[PDB]
């Protein structure tokens, strides 16, 4: 059901590096060509959040894009800001999962570059081949293969933007899922679910009395051989 072998949505990953931030590349997800074609030199000319989330192509209702937006405001942190346009299309396909053309989808995004778009359509969507779209653009479809393929770019961004931790309930429930959906989904890349330690208990605001049900997921070292 996939050109990737055997049901796992993991592309060519890395487990055999030495650097902490370089344990998993986004080149496994977003290739070199689309990653370097962003006119990014106009974002941090402005600073206020009203003047940042109102010139992007997509405006959501919630703060699920901007939950780490104040963690990057300096232009010393531009490498993950290319992911924040991808934050603006992290939900760019699934909350419009019903419709699958592009010129109707052009009224969803106020003038983006189309070269930034069709790396996700060619792989992560299952195409309806129709020439009624092809004089315009590339139509597609989302099959029932595509329910847990659409979250790992949070386990390498929302993990990545706060020094490699992920908490359950601001992730299992801001994505609207039950916290038992993920335990059979934790070990799809090499992630480890674990409890409450002796130092990092303050990273959400929990006591020690629910510490056996306070379960965290993080990455420190290359995955244990």
């Amino acid at each position: 059901d996939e050109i990737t072998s055997n049901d796992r949505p993991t592309p060519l990953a890395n487990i055999d590096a030495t650097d902490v931030e370089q344990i998993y590349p986004i080149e496994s997800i977003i290739p070199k060509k689309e990653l370097q074609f962003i006119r990014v030199s106009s974002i941090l000319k402005e600073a206020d959040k009203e003047k940042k989330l109102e010139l992007f192509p997509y405006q959501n209702n919630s703060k699920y894009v901007a939950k780490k937006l104040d963690s990057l405001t300096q232009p010393s942190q531009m490498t993950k800001l290319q992911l924040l346009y991808y934050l603006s299309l992290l939900l760019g396909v699934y909350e419009n999962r019903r419709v699958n053309n592009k010129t109707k989808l052009l009224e969803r995004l106020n003038s983006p570059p189309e070269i930034l778009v069709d790396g996700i359509l060619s792989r992560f969507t299952v195409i309806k081949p129709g020439q009624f779209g092809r004089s315009k653009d590339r139509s597609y479809f989302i099959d029932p293969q595509n329910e847990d393929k659409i979250l790992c770019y949070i386990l390498a961004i929302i993990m990545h933007l706060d020094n490699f931790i992920v908490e359950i309930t601001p992730l299992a429930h801001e994505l609207n899922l039950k916290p038992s959906k993920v335990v059979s989904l934790f070990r799809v890349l090499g992630a480890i679910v674990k409890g409450a330690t002796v130092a990092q208990a303050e990273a959400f605001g929990i006591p020690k009395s629910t510490a056996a049900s306070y379960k965290i997921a993080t990455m420190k070292v290359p995955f244990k051989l």
């Binding site: 081949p129 129709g130 020439q131 092809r134």
Partner: protein
């Protein structure tokens, strides 16, 4: 008006020279192509386009299928007044181990 025109009339399509209804398609066309309707049994694969010199194919037999391939043959098929239950039946009996053939009056 009763036993055929209940809801079971249709313009089903029959490949003549093998005699089936379940075999043909309304194929997803090429870029400019319109109304690409063909059969798959009386056709053959374009990987077998070999051989008198090799004859130049005439573009009325190059036609895109569903999976993405390209194969060649089995073109003409018209609309035949058929019940769907018969269209159910010749695949019901194909599975049990009987091959089936039909034919029409205009050849």
């Amino acid at each position: 008006d009763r036993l055929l025109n209940s809801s079971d009339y249709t313009q089903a399509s029959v490949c003549r020279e093998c005699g089936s209804i379940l075999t043909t398609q309304q194929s997803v066309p090429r870029i400019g192509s319109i109304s690409t309707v063909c059969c798959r049994r009386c056709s053959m694969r374009f990987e077998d386009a070999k051989k008198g010199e090799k004859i130049f194919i005439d573009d009325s037999q190059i036609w895109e299928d569903g999976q993405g391939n390209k194969f060649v043959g089995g073109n003409e098929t018209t609309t035949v007044a058929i019940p769907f239950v018969l269209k159910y039946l010749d695949s019901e009996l194909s599975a049990m181990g009987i091959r089936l053939r039909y034919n029409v009056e205009p050849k």
